[PDB]
Each structure stands twice: as C-alpha cells, then as structure tokens.
Design a protein around this nucleic acid. Structure first.
Ligand code: DZ4
Ligand code: MG
Ligand code: MG
Length: 425
DNA sequence: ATTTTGACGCT
C-alpha cells in the first residue's frame, strides 16, 4: 500500500527521428520529399543494402536489410539515395553531423543522453516542476498538445480518436495538485511538443516521442504512434498495455534473454511476469535481470538518464564478404590504412570540437571460416593521431593470426579499428 | 553477401 513505490518520481521522454537518414537526404534533395525512398550502402551487390526507409516506401513492404534490387520488385518507383563512399568504404559523416544538429537543439531544453544516432532520452522532472510553478494552477488546453496521443484512451477517423482520448485525459486531470504524476507527465508532453516543434523548425526533420516515468516506457511509447506524433504512457495505462504486449517489444528483451523468459516461464506477454516472485525471477535470470523484470513488468524502472551527449568511442569498420576476403599482406595493410585514415580524420575533428583525446586503439578482425563475428579483438596504446602509425600498430597486433608459410591465411572477412578511453585535452 | 557502428555486461 502506502510503502510500495510506484515508479512515478520522474518524467522521462525519448525522442526518436522518423526515418532519419531518409529525412537527411530528403532535406538535401527536394526531389525525394514525400516519395517512397530508401537509403542504401554500396550498389554493386544486388543494388545495395537498405538501411533506412521512408514511410511511403514502408507502405509497399520495403524494409531495412532488404537489397535494393529486391525492394524495387515491391516498389518499382522507389527512389534511392546512396551513402557516401570514401577510401573504399561507407562514410556516415553526413548523418553524424545531422545528429549533432538535433542533439544540440534538444540540449537547450534539458540534459540529454544520446542513445543512438537519432534518439535521445530527456529527464524533464525539473523542467516540469518549473513549468507547473509558472502555470499557477492554470488548466492545460488541448491546443498545447496538438500531436499527442494518450495511450489507452479513449475508452468507455484517426485524428478524431486522438482528440477524443486527449479530451478524456485532460477532463480527468487534477490541475491544482502539483505532485500528481499524471499532471507531471502532461506538462512533460507540453514541453516535448515544444522541443519537437523546435527540432522541425530549426532542422526540417520530423520526429516522434514517448513521455512516461522511465526510459523503457518512454521508448515503448515513442513507437506506438510513429511517425510525427508523440505518446504519453501513464503509470495507470501499464496493466492493460502490458497485458497483450509481446515480451520482445521491451528494450533489452528483443534477443536471447527475452526468448529465455518466454521459454522458461511459458508466457508470452510482459504483464504475465507479474505472477512470479522477485526471487523466482532472480533464480531463473540472475539477481540483476530478475529484479529488473520484477519491477519492469509493473511499469517501474530506475535506470537514470545519463548526462552524455557525445559518443564514448569512435570506430571504423569494413566487411569483406565471400570472395572479397583479404588474402594478401598488401591488401590487409592497405585496408588497415584506409580505416586508420578515416579514423584519424574523425579523431582530429573530435579533439578540436570536444576537447578530448582517445588513448586506446582496439583492433578487431574476423577470419574466413570462423563462426564468431570477431576472430580477434586486441587493444594497444593510441598515443598519436596518425593514420600510418595506427595502421602499423594494428597490423603489429594482428599479424600473428596469419598461418601463411606475403599471403594471408585464413582470409580476413572483417577489419575494425576503434578509438576508446577518452581523456580531457 | 545487409553493413556499420556504439553502449554496456560478464568474467
Ligand atoms: N541495422 C542498421 N544498420 C545500419 N544503420 C542502421 C540500422 N538500423 C538503423 N540504422 C540507421 C539508419 C536509420 O535512419 C537510423 C535510425 O534508426 P531507427 O531509429 O531505428 N530507424 P529510422 O529512424 O530510419 O525510422 P523510424 O525510427 O521512424 O522507425 O540509424
Ligand atoms: Mg528513428
Ligand atoms: Mg532510433
């Protein structure tokens, strides 16, 4: 009763860009706007691999991971934009720079945690408290929430339903109680509307957002009404929402651990987890996972929004599939150099922009035949931003993987260089 | 022969 926490202490949002790389290319090239279109990497093999897909193209069944040649069979008028290639490899600079544009706008509203190239969590608890004091007991108008859905409502056309639900929600709010979690979430949603409007005004990019009491629910909420909408998931919405929510839809449960929860417990939906004790869950999934599941299935999570706007590592990777695997010393050294040159460029820019220097270089390879993604992953000192030195050091750290009696055996199917362990500069 | 990343957990 009175002593059981309900995980309603924070307001957390997750903002995620809609079909991000596609919007970057559509801003650049107006001919692609409002069209079925996709972003691809490479072009020779089956037209290139798709990494982002506009919503118009998704209506035809185009998805990420599809070869463009196959996507064209589903959507003959599909337009394509190709990722830049530099030094023989895909170069994602344009998208990293566009991400910085968006993150810098979001950071004006609150401290953000960069969760990926196109999404960030926001802890709005303080901003909501400030806005609630500003409002001075004033009711919140539906006009302040023009793109907000309230999950679970209405109860008891698309835009018509959205407005019905929002009206039910606002009608039910206790505006004069500044500690009401539902009121706090609603003010959070007002702020997120302002943030999303700022992003669109200042970059041209549209996005979706989730507003809830924690990161997992905010992330889940964000996807419920993509694109170009935001969704509020209240604590009270959790039992119904989770009662038919596949376990795999919750962040971190989309892989092996989620599969094991389903198999071991004989359940399908997140809400079914409430029928196990914390000790039972810890017994099957470990102390950490068990406690996390016990709270999460009740809508409770405590993972903080970490104050981190910049990536913690800077890496460069290339696969060499099938017959393109690297089989000569000259090939291996040339490609290590290419990767190191891109890495040097990004590191030098990072040092100038962000007042830090990486101190460790991680080298990873895969050998043809090896079932593992990586055959070797070894570190060495990163003491100077110099591509020839980094490539020589990477070769030094991997040369013993070569069985060859000038020849490289087994052929290499992947090279990877990653700068880590940043210090202030 | 989707690829190119990037955060975090385990031992
Ligand atoms: N498997 C992959 N490999 C490479 N790049 C990828 C990728 N998945 C995504 N990206 C890149 C390309 C993506 O544009 C970007 C963000 O990924 P999302 O947020 O998961 N998907 P999007 O924003 O496109 O659509 P929406 O969120 O509206 O559903 O990351
Ligand atoms: Mg996105
Ligand atoms: Mg995303």
């Amino acid at each position: 009763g009175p002593h059981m926490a309900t995980g309603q202490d924070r307001v957390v949002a997750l903002v995620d860009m809609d079909c991000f790389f596609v919007q970057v290319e559509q801003r650049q090239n107006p001919h692609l706007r409002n069209k079925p279109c996709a972003v691809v990497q490479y072009k020779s093999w089956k037209g290139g691999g798709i990494i982002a897909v506009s919503y118009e193209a998704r209506a035809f069944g185009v998805t990420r991971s599809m070869w463009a040649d196959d996507a064209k069979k589903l959507c003959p008028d599909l337009l394509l934009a190709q990722v830049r290639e530099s030094r023989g490899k895909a170069n994602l600079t344009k998208y990293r720079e566009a991400s910085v544009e968006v993150m810098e706008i979001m950071s004006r509203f609150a401290v953000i945690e960069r969760a990926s190239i196109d999404e960030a969590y926001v802890d709005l608890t303080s901003a909501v408290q400030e806005r609630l004091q500003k409002l001075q007991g004033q009711p919140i108008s539906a006009d302040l929430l023009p793109s907000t859905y309230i999950e679970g409502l209405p109860q008891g056309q698309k835009e018509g339903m959205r407005k019905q639900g929002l009206f039910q929600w606002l009608d039910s709010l206790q505006i004069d109680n500044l500690t009401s979690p539902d009121l706090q979430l609603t003010v959070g949603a007002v702020i997120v509307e302002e943030m999303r409007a700022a992003i669109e005004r200042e970059t041209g990019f549209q996005c979706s957002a989730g507003i809830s009491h924690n990161k997992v629910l905010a992330k889940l909420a964000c996807g419920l009404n993509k694109p170009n909408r935001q969704t509020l998931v209240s604590h009270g919405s959790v039992p119904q929402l989770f009662s038919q929510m596949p376990i795999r839809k919750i962040r971190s449960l989309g892989g092996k651990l989620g599969a094991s929860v389903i198999e071991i417990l004989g359940i399908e939906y997140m809400g079914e987890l409430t029928q196990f004790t914390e000790s039972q869950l810890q017994s099957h999934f470990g102390e950490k996972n068990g406690s996390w599941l016990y709270a999460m299935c009740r809508g409770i999570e405590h993972d903080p929004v970490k104050p981190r706007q910049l990536p913690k590592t800077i890496g460069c990777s290339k696969n060499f599939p099938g017959k393109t695997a690297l089989a000569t010393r000259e090939q291996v050294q040339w490609w290590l150099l290419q990767l190191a040159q891109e890495l040097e460029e990004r590191l030098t820019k990072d040092r100038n922009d962000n007042d830090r220097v990486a101190t460790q270089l991680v080298v990873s390879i895969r050998v043809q035949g090896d079932k593992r993604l990586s055959s070797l992953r070894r570190c060495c000192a990163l003491t100077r931003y110099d591509a020839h030195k980094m490539s020589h050091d990477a070769f030094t750290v991997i040369k013993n993987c070569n069985t060859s009696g000038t020849e490289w055996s087994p052929p290499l199917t992947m090279l990877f260089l990653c700068a880590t362990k940043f210090s202030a500069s």
